[PDB]
Design a protein around this nucleic acid. Structure first.
Lengths: 133, 260, 203
RNA sequence: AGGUUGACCUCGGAUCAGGUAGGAGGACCCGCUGAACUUAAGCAUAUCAAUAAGCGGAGGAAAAGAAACCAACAGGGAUUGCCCUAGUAACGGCGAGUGAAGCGGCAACAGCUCAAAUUUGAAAGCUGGCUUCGGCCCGCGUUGUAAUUUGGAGAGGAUGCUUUGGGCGAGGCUCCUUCUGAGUUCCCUGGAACGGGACGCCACAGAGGGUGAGAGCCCCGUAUAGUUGGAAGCCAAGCCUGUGUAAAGCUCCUUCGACGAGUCGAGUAGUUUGGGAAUGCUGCUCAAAAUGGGAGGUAAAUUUCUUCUAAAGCUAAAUACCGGCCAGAGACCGAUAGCGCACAAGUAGAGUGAUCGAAAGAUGAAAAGCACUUUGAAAAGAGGGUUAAAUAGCACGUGAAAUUGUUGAAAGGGAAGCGCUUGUGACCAGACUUGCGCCCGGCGGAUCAUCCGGUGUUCUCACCGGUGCACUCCGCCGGGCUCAGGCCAG
RNA sequence: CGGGACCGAGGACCGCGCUCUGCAAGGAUGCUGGCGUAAUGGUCACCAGCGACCCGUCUUGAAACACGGACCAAGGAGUCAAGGUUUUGCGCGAGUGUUUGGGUGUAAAACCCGCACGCGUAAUGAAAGUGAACGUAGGUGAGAGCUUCGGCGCAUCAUCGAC
RNA sequence: CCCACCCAUACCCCGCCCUCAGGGUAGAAACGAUGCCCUGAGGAGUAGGCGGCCGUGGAGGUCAGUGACGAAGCCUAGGGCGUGAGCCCGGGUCGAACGGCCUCUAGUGCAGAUCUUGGUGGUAGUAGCAAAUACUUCAAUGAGAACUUGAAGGACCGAAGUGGGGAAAGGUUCCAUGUGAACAGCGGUUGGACAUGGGUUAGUCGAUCCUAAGCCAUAGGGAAGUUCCGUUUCAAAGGGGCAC
RNA sequence: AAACUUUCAACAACGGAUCUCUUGGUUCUGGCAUCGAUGAAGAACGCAGCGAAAUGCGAUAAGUAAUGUGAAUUGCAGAAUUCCGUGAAUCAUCGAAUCUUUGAACGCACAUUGCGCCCGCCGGUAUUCCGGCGGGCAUGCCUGUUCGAGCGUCAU
């Protein structure tokens, strides 16, 4: 149960915020879990997804397919995975939109900022566990 | 809104040979022009008897009658048939009213939800807690859009003494669905008789059951009411020797033979 | 007898904000207490007797202590509002009893007062010493210095030998005679003046 | 030089140096001005109403406010607001109606500044300009700028004690920032599990939302203590220091003790009020006083008494809020509803103009929005495809009725429709299918009766373990017999 | 003593009786046949015999006149507040009413608190004012109920007294 | 005057429904006692009064309720229950929620209101598409030509024009190219329609300047004020020249 | 017999009811005090590679600077991002800026892109002519400065 007066449990306000969120908020909204190996390596459960990550689809009709993230259509709240496509009528290839909560990240596209994100998440989790323990 | 249906300029076209005498929107060049207005029978018009905020929403109830009802609900909570008739799963409960030792709840003993849930399963409220857990359903109607999405049954109410048991048991029991908590000195009829139905299943602490008498002695202007009936066992009264020895002989049977 | 002949619907005040306003008042009181700590949240008030014959049986709290009460209690009028005492320059002490009661009230407050120095490193002789500065305090002068006996006791036991004899002729007759004398005060004065004038004329 | 040379006063100029006002908003607030519909049978008193419209002026509140008060008491003691007083006192054609205040309980509390005095042993005061920031100038001002005093007093005396200025500051609070628990385990349905079943886990978090269908553990968030980094304020335990040049308080007193004028008040007129004998405001005429003046709700004279101290001024809080900004909610409405507006809505459109003012939401999880062939000038059609579904094709969820087309059945010699009752044709729901009980025969087993031990109970009834050794129990399979069985009839 | 029609309510026994091994006596059984399915039964359409004005409104006593109605969907009209009054249920009871406010809270809820106040406990008079027991709270006639069978007498009514 | 016969919701007998009335029913083997058993009588109804039930949106409780193995809604010459309002089931369609019971609550029940909004009929392939004299031939274009084009003919306006240009008003309608639908009350390849582009060149033409009828500032006076009057005034309302 | 009219049924039409949905209304509660001559509210006209509107913005024009985040935007086109970074984005924040013609609206006017005046700077052969650019010029009132007027009162 929510306690804080700044927290609203209004369904109307929640849906308005979700479907009118700006791009930086949508980046946080399209987060994906890490694989078990990455979770034990980094002590991180979930991260915002980005182009160049390698994912495994665990839900839907394209389950167990693997590939790299080729596009993050934040306007459609969807990601595109290479070779997870379908055929149009005309015989051309069109990407299939996958929600990032239906995939699991198996390889991270790493740079300095991503390492900073992972490090500060790990440090916060350890600090919280130490304080509550 | 008090201005609803009245933000229009409209006049009746008068008695004539063609149309009804409802006021009609003046002007031209739009669909609204010439259409009916202001009537409760008109589209985009004012409703009949518009609702006002000075309707009587709140009900003043005598404090003596509130105390009477709370005492009756507390007495009904100690009757095991009424708990079953209200729908609580109490077949494995060892005793009604159920009193748990305050050493099992005081301080931080059940500050964790797992510990509180384990205590409920140990004392026998587990089937009622599981009944609430399995009862969750989606509500039928517009209440889903209006912030009331789900319905579930009521579980046990844990009554505690804040002075002797503390208040961390509240945090411990809070996340379990259907389980409510209440201090012994602020008992609530809405919890003691949910939906106006008597027989709420209550788990008492020993401190709360020891403080209840002082709670009812400290209520100014109220005494526990005297009943109009001394002996509620009607069968015992009717079939006692004192009444039966003075009766007339029966003038018939439960079934009467047809004469002609 | 319904007074709904004006446009009454424009001036209907509902009170849905009653619990919210109680919450706001309690938050303001808690903020005021936190700002004033360790002083009490209110000022000391004197005991006064209500006016008119309906209410002169009962005492209550007044606005502030009089200047003569402060003088008889030894509290200067510039110091008094700085140590939580309300001052009323309009009220006078027409009788000794109210004056004495309020002077005793001020003396009890002054005896229970703990006065911290303006500079901690330089205490003065009128200031409370640090080893008396620690004691249990009250933060509600309306409670700790309330009206203890608003009314006189309605019941009292005396010995049968100490029963008063009563006014001669009876209480009812005494009331009738007092009313009659009040109605005839001027007639008797005029008659006495006329008799004196006649005696002076024909002495 | 005196027909000159100056000082002032008043009045002007300047794109002079520096400032300020206007308009918007106006829910709430302070004033002004001011109706009628209505209600009184009608209707000029009245009521609606000291309201709407109109006009001027503020703020986050405004306004009011530290008694020329209430009272008549054993007296209360600035203002505001709530409850009560109280539908009361009172006012009112031909009566419809109108209608306060003191006390009392409570919310909140906070007190003060001038004018009237000679600093007169020293205009001690101040705007502006220039500054080397030390000050120096141009002025204002004695037709009075400071200090001192404001009625609670004060001024002068007497008297002996008390009082004060700066600088640090531990720590705390307010606001943005980093970070937070647990299954995408197995089986079934499904296009997709977020459904069903199983096995777990978290919970100070089972609020809310998203994700291909009802998700605490997939994702955002949610709970609680905290934990990173930054800024600006406020409060504050304490601690260093200067001390009396000066200012300040208390106590007593012979004496002194200024206190607001075309104002108060009166008459009259209009308006207003419960104050149509007792109200307020404004205009005109008259026009004060010094223990004086005002008030003391019936006019006047005389004698008292009680209360304040007008005609100058400031001030937080408790109170209001259909405007604005931010936020949280609801036994509210669910696209003819709810705001006129859920949509490029105060839009399109109309009117010279003031103004008036709509209609209009929903493919699908995903466009996967139909490749390719064929017929047509094309729109399109047909194949063939996509989809879980095109019985979802950008006329798009569902798809009612009026009304229409086709197919099938039927009726019809100047209305049909309806009630009762047969018949014909078409089309249907039930009921029934066998059960129970005996007598034989064949199987398959010993949860037959009695007794013993334990346990439970309603305390005399049961269950469980041993005992049966098959003329006793329990099912099954073949016969035979009795009874009861559906519809219409004699 | 025949002939015919319609009907079979009830569901152990009990009763009244009689022509008394039993019965026609407080309500139908016995025997038999065909069929066991659209055969009985039902629905719809139509024909046939008989029956049958178009609804609502208005008016008066009534008709008639008059008014509204092309058809369908959705919308569409005795509500809310304040104040009285009578009746029902409930709590307490010579008292009663927490909710203006305060305390408290899991926070518009629930729980708790009390000063004042309202109404009631006294009326009457314009007012000043005064202010309810002769008596087991009276006599008499009724009166449910109780009774020790002598009476005692509720509510209420009637009538004479008292304050 | 006589005999028989016909039939009303009337009268008689019987069944069933409801209402009213009168009885029975506990040392309970005992009951939706708000029940059951026995007996009798009665049955029209406007204004009006009272009771009980049915249905709709929402709220508390409860049914360990139903549901993608198909909720709600809709259609149904298919059935069952109820005197009835209604309730329940089968079949078809469909796609995400919903219902029973006891209480609580209301913007809660339609045939009418010349009712409101929207949609749709008969009339009806009907009235009509008849002022301004009038069209015809060949060829081309095109799927298609009375109302497109070229040529060939015939006519009309008849200089107060059916001509050549402007003022007001409009605002791109102008020009070229292309064009499905819609519009051009018939057609359409055409169009002032639709689509994409292009086009308006000034010392001398106008505006700009002048004043007319008239309007508005200023000084100043009114007005509670928005503002009214005032335009030469009861205004210190400014130009030039010269200077050892 | 058909046709026609009417009735009943199935399917197809017409139409948009019903059901479910809801980034919207409505009502209540809590918090806050902040428009403008330093030019507001309002109006007009413009600005994107490809927009008419809505939205955003002002010739620095779907935006600039700064801070933060950390890889998009997306209908098409075209470019990315040294990804181990002075850095994508129709991102967030927002303290620095830009802010056309107007409008209380201010040189005078405005039914005119009309007519001026003052002071600078630049260019064109230029002491004279022409052009461009920059800064200014409303009213009432206050304080002050300075220049004045009047036998209004005086001194000399």
């Amino acid at each position: 149960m929510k306690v804080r007066p700044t927290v609203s449990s209004s369904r109307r306000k929640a849906r308005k915020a979700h479907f009118s969120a700006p791009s930086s908020v949508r980046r946080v909204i399209m987060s994906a879990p890490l694989s078990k190996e990455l979770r034990e390596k980094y002590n991180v459960r979930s991260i915002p997804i980005r182009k160049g990550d390698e994912v495994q689809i665990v839900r839907g009709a394209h389950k167990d397919k693997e590939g790299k993230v080729t596009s993050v259509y934040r306007l459609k709240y969807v990601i595109h995975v290479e070779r997870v496509t379908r055929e149009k009528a005309t015989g051309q290839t069109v990407p299939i939109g996958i929600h990032p909560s239906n995939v699991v990240i198996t390889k991270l596209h790493l740079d300095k900022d991503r390492e900073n994100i992972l490090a500060r998440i790990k440090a916060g989790r350890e600090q919280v566990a130490k304080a509550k323990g | 809104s008090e201005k609803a249906g009245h933000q229009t300029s409209a006049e009746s076209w008068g008695t004539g040979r063609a149309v009804a005498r409802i006021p009609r929107v003046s002007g031209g060049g739009t669909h609204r022009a010439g259409q009916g207005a202001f009537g409760n029978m008109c589209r985009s018009g004012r409703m009949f008897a518009p609702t006002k905020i000075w309707r009587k929403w709140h009900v003043k109830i005598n404090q003596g009658q509130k105390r009477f009802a709370t005492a009756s609900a507390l007495a009904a909570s100690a009757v095991a048939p009424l708990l079953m008739a209200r729908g609580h799963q109490v077949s494995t409960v060892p005793e009604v009213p159920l009193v748990v030792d305050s050493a099992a709840v005081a301080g931080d003993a059940v500050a964790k939800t797992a510990a509180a849930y384990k205590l409920l399963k140990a004392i026998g409220a587990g089937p009622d807690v599981e009944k609430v857990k399995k009862s969750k359903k989606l509500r039928a109607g517009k209440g889903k859009m209006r912030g009331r999405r789900h319905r579930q049954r009521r579980g046990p109410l844990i009554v505690y003494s804040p002075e002797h048991d503390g208040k961390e048991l509240v945090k411990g029991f809070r996340n379990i669905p259907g389980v409510e908590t209440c201090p012994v000195d602020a008992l609530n009829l809405l919890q003691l008789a949910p939906g106006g139905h008597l027989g709420r299943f209550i788990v008492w602490t020993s401190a709360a059951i020891k403080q209840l008498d002082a709670v009812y002695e400290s209520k100014k202007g109220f005494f526990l009411p005297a009943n109009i009936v001394s002996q509620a066992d009607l069968s015992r009264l009717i079939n006692s020797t004192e009444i039966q020895s003075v009766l007339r002989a029966p003038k018939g049977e439960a079934r009467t033979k047809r004469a002609c | 007898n319904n007074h709904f002949r004006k446009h009454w619907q424009r001036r209907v005040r509902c009170h849905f904000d009653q619990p919210g306003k109680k919450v706001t008042r309690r938050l303001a009181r808690r903020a005021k207490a936190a700002a004033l700590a360790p002083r009490p949240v209110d000022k000391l008030r004197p005991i006064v007797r209500c006016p008119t014959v309906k209410y002169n049986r009962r005492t209550r709290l007044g606005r502030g202590f009089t200047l003569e009460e402060l003088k008889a209690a030894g509290i200067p009028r510039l110091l008094a509002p700085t140590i939580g005492i309300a001052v009323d320059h309009r009220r006078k002490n027409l009788s000794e009893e109210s004056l004495a009661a309020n002077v005793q009230r001020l003396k009890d407050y002054k005896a229970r007062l703990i006065l911290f120095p303006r500079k901690s490193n330089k205490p003065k002789k009128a200031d409370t010493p640090k080893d008396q500065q620690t004691a249990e305090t009250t933060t509600s002068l309306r409670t700790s210095f309330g009206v203890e006996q608003p009314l006189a006791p309605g019941f009292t036991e005396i010995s049968k030998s100490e029963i008063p004899a009563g006014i001669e002729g009876g209480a009812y007759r005494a009331l009738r005679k007092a009313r009659s004398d009040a109605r005839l005060v001027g007639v008797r004065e005029k008659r006495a003046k006329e008799k004196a004038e006649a005696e002076a004329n024909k002495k």
